Symmetry: D2
Subunit: 287 residues, 4 copies
């Protein structure tokens, strides 16, 4: 029973670093895992491979003309703990949709039997900033059943988490896409955990883990590796094992209940992220 | 002589706040301006209208028909300096295309006569992060002739500027969509201005204005207004006026020259945005070494 | 019973702002309070007087000849909630001892009957980075019997908290000086509450209150006033009222048990303030690894 | 001709890091340097010695019983480039004076013959926050002719630089103590470089060098070393060399011109560090609008 998961979140909150660290922890737990990158704005395999930038399917397509000309050897590389790594390749700037690329790639792996192994998990690393048809393609085509959202106590991070839930709600009726949990990439802020726990509560889900900020992540990042690999004894390592072990044991798969912009702002203000609004100063000149 | 302009850039660097502030400067200078928010996940008109969120074209279409049903009066609101304000609205989570929404909005506004009315400038506030077919829709359909790029001295904001320039290069043989300059939104970091100037020379453009950080910006955003409106005497207010001025007189429209990822890494690593790599230590564990 | 208190801690963590907000909360609870400024690098009475820089006893005495020509009225002002405010004035650069100016202030206040019987609290706002002889004067001279340490999760603020504790141990069996509690000035950090509680655990004291980081404090600071006065219906206001009340009902005075530098580092590493060291690569050049 | 210098500056701005990387660049250039640490809150020698904590004169003397039965080998350690490293030790918490232990350390080093013929520089690393008599001890005793003030474009760092400048003025005629320049220790901020030069112009001095923020410094420090030793190929290394070279070549030893607090505020404001004071809201309640 291979589990088809995806990680969704906006960019610039460390979504990909967490994806790779968690996956490494799976490999260290003796799970066989594939990472499929579906994010143009981040490398989703660099830390597993030790590479700078894996060649994507989209740019290897030009090398021979079409994806039917491609060998699976060129696209799918093995790295740490024999984690299987692939990068779809983002759209050509101005002349491409991101759904089409991710379809192209997922069917290529299907045709070539990448999904035909003793594979325990596949994790699609997906950009979930602006949740259009394109980035919602793994959901729509039912290519990921278990969605995890990487977010944080930042406004836009939680907005993204809310739209991602909405996107899910769309194709919930159709296919078995569910929300597995929220993952908090800490910003080393106070009450951030509680914030996301309360957001989870309202979404009808769970904060499956709080991922702290810890310099050992960056120290592993310099060496193009995960923390699991770099330093198994780091206290950060137990943090990714906890997340990983919780995903494995996870049986909580819901249809989320998105929230309103006021219902959100209410959260922000409750946990001291946003301040209580004051209309007496609204529209009022300094003179 | 209406000039159709777009501001492209990524989220989280205050693109919209610069657009609103810029536009308030123009109105204060006596120009008539319309703003078409084409950024999902951004309130592009909130400072002009003193509103928490404008009604978006896409969300009122949720009723039925982004045409007919929708009335320009329920779409287009005037605000500070008689600035006309429109919010296209983002795509339906999971289903719709963002560019399809934007064009529909723009088509609606054409079809309802908004682009008359004695307009000196219209500004499209467009998301330009992952510049897909979607967000390059206003370029392909030549809905904006001049493109300004909001960027900061940050990896991703500079990679977006790059992808925005590739998208302009893709359609420069079709239409007359040209890059007008980079606007740098400060992160209050050393050497940021030099960084962007270097990006400009490579992209084949100019850093048209350096927009400093200043608490008077947030102070005005809190009150849901621009600095130009909140305190025109402020020093930050003079900066937005200078931006507005250089845009009015801007005579430089170019086909940019996108750089390669190595050339981009070369540039970060000059200004220390990226660290120099010690590749001897790559793949090495804490125990080994 | 006029409780003779002192706030100690290093600069740059908002010690003073907490003191004044705290003392504002006491004077709103109908208390009679005197703040004596014993910190050269902080205006300890600015927010109470709505004043830029209160004139110090050392400044005034020089423009007079001596502390004997000095009138009480130029040196002790009443502010919000009729709080009495005094500023000792730090040492003359290069010559004077921070302590000597403090003792002059205290003797002048004692000489001129500034310490009234009705008074419910005196707070000394004392610098507490380097806990030398000069800055431990209140404690040596038995003027400060109840010490509150304003700290935070940054190393120097905690090291300083430990050094102020060692200062207390010295005079605890000469006079009745006791540590009353730690006061966390939050840097909007994760686990910072748990850190100071665990520091207090080791010291024998308690973390009496955690003061949040809230922008209304800054909004109030800017207007040279406390949150108690600026906006009583603010949530931060309730946070100072909490602190003040806990202070009012505090019966836990103790002799602290300072900790080894090894123990301190054990705490910072456990709460992520210090990094776990990679001792193998110590002293190694990047060329040799 | 040995040159007796001193690095004054406030805590927490990486003064001692700059000191040690500076001496490394002097040593790389074949100069004989001794670092004498006079900071209670900092290791002035750890990066040279690759050691967690050098034993101080205070504690070593505390062990023996007096400083007359203390051997030179015990305190004076050699490190990278055979830089001589010494640590005065801070004051006995609550009782001690910081100037007592520094005069002690200097007399010992004198008698034991640590100040050798071959030595080209000695540097005292003194905490320069509150410039009392005790911390001005190297100046008063005329043990430091050249003073370099580390600072940054921040209120309190510039204030401390100001107070140090008054400390020099005081003993300027008596001794031969001059100010040699400011060293800006970057916080990666805009206009900070323009600010410290402007301060320098008001003190009647110069900015000798602007030290960038660069992660390599922390990469070196984690391994308990200077950049010069970590990686002499890094752009930072050259920065420490430029600083060191300019110091070697420096011919600008002045008596400073300290500025008023108002003058310092005018500088902060001119370079966007402070906002202009809105006196129209000082005293004013939130509800009072
Ligand atoms: S559907 Fe989304 S990814 Fe595809 S072109 Fe439109 S905006 Fe871009
Ligand atoms: S006791 Fe403290 S304040 Fe007094 S001179 Fe010595 S170091 Fe300075
Ligand atoms: Mg090791
Ligand atoms: Mg007396
Ligand atoms: Mg190397």
């Amino acid at each position: 029973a291979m589990r088809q998961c995806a990680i969704y979140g906006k960019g610039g909150i460390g979504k990909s670093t967490t994806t790779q660290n968690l996956v490494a922890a799976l490999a260290e737990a003796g799970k066989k895992v594939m990472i499929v990158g579906c994010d143009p704005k981040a490398d989703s395999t660099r830390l597993i491979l030790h590479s700078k930038a894996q060649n994507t399917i989209m740019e290897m397509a030009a090398e021979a003309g079409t994806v039917e000309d491609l060998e699976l050897e060129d696209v799918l590389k093995a790295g740490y703990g024999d984690i299987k790594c692939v990068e779809s390749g983002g759209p050509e700037p101005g002349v491409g949709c991101a759904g089409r690329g991710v379809i192209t790639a997922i069917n290529f792996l299907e045709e070539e039997g990448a999904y035909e192994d003793d594979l325990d998990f596949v994790f699609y690393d997906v950009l979930g900033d602006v949740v259009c048809g394109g980035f919602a393609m793994p959901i729509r085509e039912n290519k990921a059943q278990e969605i995890y959202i990487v977010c944080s106590g930042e406004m836009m991070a939680m907005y993204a988490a809310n739209n991602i839930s909405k996107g899910i709600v769309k194709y919930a009726n159709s296919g078995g896409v569910r929300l597995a949990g929220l993952i908090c990439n800490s910003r080393n802020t106070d009450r951030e955990d509680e914030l996301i726990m309360a957001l989870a509560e309202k979404l009808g889900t769970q904060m499956i883990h709080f991922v702290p900020r810890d310099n050992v992540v960056q120290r592993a990042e310099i060496r193009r590796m995960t923390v699991i690999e770099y330093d198994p004894k780091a206290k950060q390592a137990d943090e990714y094992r906890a997340l990983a072990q919780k995903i494995i044991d996870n049986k909580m798969l819901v249809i989320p209940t998105p929230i309103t912009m006021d219902e959100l702002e209410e959260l922000l203000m409750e946990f001291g992220i946003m301040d209580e609004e004051d209309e007496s100063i609204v529209g009022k000149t300094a003179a």
